[PDB]
Amino acid sequence: MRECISIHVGQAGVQIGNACWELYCLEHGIQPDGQMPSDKTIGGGDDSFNTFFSETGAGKHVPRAVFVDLEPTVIDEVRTGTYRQLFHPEQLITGKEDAANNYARGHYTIGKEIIDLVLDRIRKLADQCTGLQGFLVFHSFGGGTGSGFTSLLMERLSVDYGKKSKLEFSIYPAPQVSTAVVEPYNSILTTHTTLEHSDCAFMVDNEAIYDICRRNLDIERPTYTNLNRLISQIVSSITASLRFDGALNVDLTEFQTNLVPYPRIHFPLATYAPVISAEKAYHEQLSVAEITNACFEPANQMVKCDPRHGKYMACCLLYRGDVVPKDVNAAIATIKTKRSIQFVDWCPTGFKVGINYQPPTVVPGGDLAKVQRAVCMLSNTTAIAEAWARLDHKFDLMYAKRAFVHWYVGEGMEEGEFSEAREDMAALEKDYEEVGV
Amino acid sequence: MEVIELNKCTSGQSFEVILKPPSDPSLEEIQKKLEAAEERRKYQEAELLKHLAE
Amino acid sequence: MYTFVVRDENSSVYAEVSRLLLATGQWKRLRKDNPRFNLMLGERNRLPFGRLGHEPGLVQLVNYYRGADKLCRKASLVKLIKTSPELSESCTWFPESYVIYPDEREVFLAAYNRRREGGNVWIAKLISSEASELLDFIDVHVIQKYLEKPLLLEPGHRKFDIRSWVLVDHLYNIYLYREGVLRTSSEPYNSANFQDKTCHLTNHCIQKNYGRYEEGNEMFFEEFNQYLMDALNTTLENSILLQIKHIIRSCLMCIEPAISTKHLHYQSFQLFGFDFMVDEELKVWLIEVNGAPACAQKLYAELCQGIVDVAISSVFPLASIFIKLHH
Amino acid sequence: REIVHIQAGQCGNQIGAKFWEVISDEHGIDPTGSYHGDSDLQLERINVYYNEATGNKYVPRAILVDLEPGTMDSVRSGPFGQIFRPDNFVFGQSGAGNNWAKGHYTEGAELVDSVLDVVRKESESCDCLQGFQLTHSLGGGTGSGMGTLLISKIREEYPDRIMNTFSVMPSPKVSDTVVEPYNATLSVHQLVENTDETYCIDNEALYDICFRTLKLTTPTYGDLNHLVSATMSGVTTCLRFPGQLNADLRKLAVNMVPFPRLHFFMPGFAPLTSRGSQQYRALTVPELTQQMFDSKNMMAACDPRHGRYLTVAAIFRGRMSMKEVDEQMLNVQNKNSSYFVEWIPNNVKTAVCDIPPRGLKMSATFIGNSTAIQELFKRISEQFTAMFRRKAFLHWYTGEGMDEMEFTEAESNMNDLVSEYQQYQDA
């Protein structure tokens, strides 16, 4: 067994971590006080769930997680929340004043104050690992802390843990729920500084999660609680192979090997189905073919884009529930004839399938209904570059007038790092278009 | 459709389906730029305190 | 009010669509780079489809179908017909076409050497026989069998091509404008030499004997239907228009899965220009499809009004000249 | 995240006393400092504006400054005067005589060190100080001259804190003396340099609202301050109350100020109400949105159609459909998109609070960084030059040590401010 440490940065990272670890405990049968009655190896073990949880002599199962926010009010709700007993106080780190939606304030000014304390608390969890394989980083592109401090942390993690893989769960900025106007700045700045330090990054456009909650959950004004519970389901599907018995994506290296042929192009698109409202009185349960066909509808993707006008480099299908290989190939046979699925010429056209028999778990009283079977598709399609084009266009509009730049320069940043970061993004869009045409 | 590498267990099973074959900066440099930006902050604050002194 | 932007000043069709929309009193035009639009009359090159459908509180619509260039490029059209089973290599209404780069040369000269046994005039896009001359002219182009026995209008012994305007709305309804046009050649068809191509190329700009038989070398459906009655004892509907409606429907229904915006976050419509070639036995051949077609002066007022009624006001309602091709 | 409140001068202490009256009622604090409310939403962020003293009392973190005892004695005698910490009353005796020089250079210099002592004492008790907010007028002497002297000295001692101001602009429609354009031009020069956010509260706009809209024939300063205290309560809602947006002064300045000198906001309020007269029909969300953007609800006499909105911040207060708020806010942006700069995407952010102000079931407060605010500074620069071209009344200032050159520099800097707002109105 090889352990994975999760790191949650900023408001979006911390609150999504709350959602995921709440879901993990329900799936593994762990209680808010850390007890796991099904675990018969008291005080230790090397099962698959021990990748994400350590064990104390009293039987407590402690997440291998560290929460860090430059401002305390979000983590304070964790310190007093329903899972207050789950975490040790040392893995919850807070400052006094936040980055104020300023990448340069989170990376340079306030980040330098706390970067050494975080790495020490991170070192405390790594010393409990018999064989660390890497980290899972949760953060937002738009936040000053989620963008600024994460990039500083990702730089240092490549130094102190040069042999470890690092995966990102990033919240792409959407104005419907965003509270900052300078989020395109923070997004480009943090993507440039983090690009060579992340092995695989799963982007989640809040616009896509918002409309999914409106369309498929009948929620008029979705809140972060609504969004984060749906996001945790996707994240749980992606990490389920690290926590459960299986042969597909068993370590973080296999995520890069299966999904990322080019180091820079490491942004797989995630599609998830079915999303069913718990208030739906009468529901006809969807079949394997129906939910596999839904993986190629843009309305079910974490980033709204058109994969028909790009090219795939890899494709995973992660099933949960009553699914057998026979029904999957029958579904893939039908879908290949009716949809535009073009792979790059240097890649085989095919799918890697992983099936977990335990159906998806839902929190009691949540918005999601229990389903018999579900699927998360991880596809590395060049169509996701549409999100970079949108983001870079908003960057180009503001930066042409140098609007809000003084806030970043006033923190010690240099105006050149803007154009330097934008140049790297212009190269990233260029790489996608080469592979995709 | 070729179904390969089928592994099974109690939790579930996995396999692969093929439809067609093919056709870092050091800690020194990090501390250096973190301090170069603090120097640019200290300089801008000094020019402010010098301006307020006049 | 609804809002729209204009990003192709060179468009004669949508220049009139701008005037019609503004004269409604319910459409306000914004500046090119204003993102808060309902409708985009976008550019012909590098249209930013990735930025459409991401403005909250705005149903966005664009006058182009992303991916439709596969049908509107001569190289892409040939590849689409050879490879798609819905059209098949044995497509009866498309002339034999091969793609050659400055390629399928080996597969091309295979058929040109079977022509030696026999008609072996080809066109590349120009017109030549034997074909060894044509390859060196190319040095991407597509070579195609030149139809040596075309239907010739009388009086005049003239060549022509038929242009049909097709509108595909946001629901992928296929609308065929009832008014077409024959872009005729004012020179008598001479099959002795193809170096002189004023009687072969039926392009309007190539004609500049012009203007003799009808105004602007444009014979519309009213007159051409009467000619077929008097001369050949048939109608335009039976002898030509059924094949035209079959070709238009086959081409668009083939690419529907790859361009349809039924469940997308933005919507698309597009006006197409299908160019047909009628031969000696009243058989229609598809020459090419045009992605940004221009209309005829007589028909601008009626067609552009229909584009607003069918493609724009259907999505943005206010306060038939088309034949729907069913599928 | 504590905020230190300062009120300087006659105007600064009268609108400041009303502000503390209004928000103390909203937070359920009585004149004696005892909390007798019903909701726990009130006290969750009560520390932003209040210190907790002995016996569970709430002392406003407010400092009262004046070069006269007249107005400040009326405050201590007022309805809420006993809530203010008595040590925070700092006052002289001579007064400033509506003279910016007396407040900034002579009379105010004697007293400013005493104020900074009280400022320092409140700041040392702060867990994490966001910054300061000053209420004052720009037309008098104390709030205008000494107010800007405090801001200059506060920035010297707390250079990494936010400086926020509520600055009342003078108007001949509501005029005390003829030298008001002199004091205002000298003060705006200071505000352009030493503040992060300034709410331009134009007395001309307050008069026109009282006269044209509320149908008050002879408006008093009390009728003007009702609009100020309603606006001040609205703009500070997201600072005082918990919600989806728990905001501070720095995030406000970061997202509202694209260029440091252009930080003068147009406040707006809806529905416009007069004192002692309650209207009984609640406004629909479309009506709140329609009025808060109307020029007749702007607290700065500027035509927003003559400029473009750089950034906009909107607050809705009451029980209403957040979906209907989102639709209406998107409806204004998409219907009048030419008035929002295209080079700042999504420059309108809206927040909703469940607690409505006293006497209203639904309200809407508007904060606008519009290039049309140049009309306010153009108006003052015209009144300034009309006197300065003849050096009229300048002896009141040169007698306090000032040189004509300082007036020339202040006139020039404000004219640069106007031309800078003009730069981004054409772009």
Ligand SMILES: Nc1nc2c(ncn2[C@@H]2O[C@H](COP(=O)(O)OP(=O)(O)OP(=O)(O)O)[C@@H](O)[C@H]2O)c(=O)[nH]1
């Ligand atoms: N999906 C999701 N997005 C969130 C959540 N919280 C914040 N965001 C998004 O994150 C962006 C702002 O970043 P935050 O995480 O709130 O800021 P931060 O990382 O704490 O950094 P600072 O507050 O600026 O110091 C906005 O675009 C929000 O839409 C959340 O709980 N779930």
Ligand SMILES: Nc1ncnc2c1ncn2[C@@H]1O[C@H](COP(=O)(O)OP(=O)(O)CP(=O)(O)O)[C@@H](O)[C@H]1O
């Ligand atoms: N296979 C063929 N057989 C006979 N004639 C042909 C032919 N291909 C083209 N032509 C003639 O050549 C003319 C020009 O050909 P083509 O349509 O490819 O050029 P073009 O793209 O400039 C016209 P447009 O773009 O306006 O539709 C046609 O109008 C037709 O008269």
Ligand SMILES: Nc1nc2c(ncn2[C@@H]2O[C@H](COP(=O)(O)OP(=O)(O)O)[C@@H](O)[C@H]2O)c(=O)[nH]1
């Ligand atoms: N809105 C409003 N304006 C005031 C009030 N009192 C004075 N003013 C304005 O302030 C200016 C006079 O400044 P004042 O504050 O009285 O002098 P100071 O004591 O030296 O600060 C004039 O332009 C008045 O119109 C008030 O209560 N409300």
Ligand SMILES: COc1ccc2c(c1)NC(=O)CN2c1nc(Cl)nc2c1CCC2
């Ligand atoms: C132009 O885009 C903006 C504008 C303002 C803000 C933000 C973004 N985001 C913030 O966090 C602070 N902020 C606010 N602040 C305060 Cl006191 N009240 C409010 C807002 C938003 C509306 C009410």
Ligand SMILES: [Ca+2]
């Ligand atoms: Ca165990």
Ligand SMILES: [Mg+2]
């Ligand atoms: Mg935060």
Ligand SMILES: [Mg+2]
């Ligand atoms: Mg053409």
Ligand SMILES: [Mg+2]
């Ligand atoms: Mg006075």
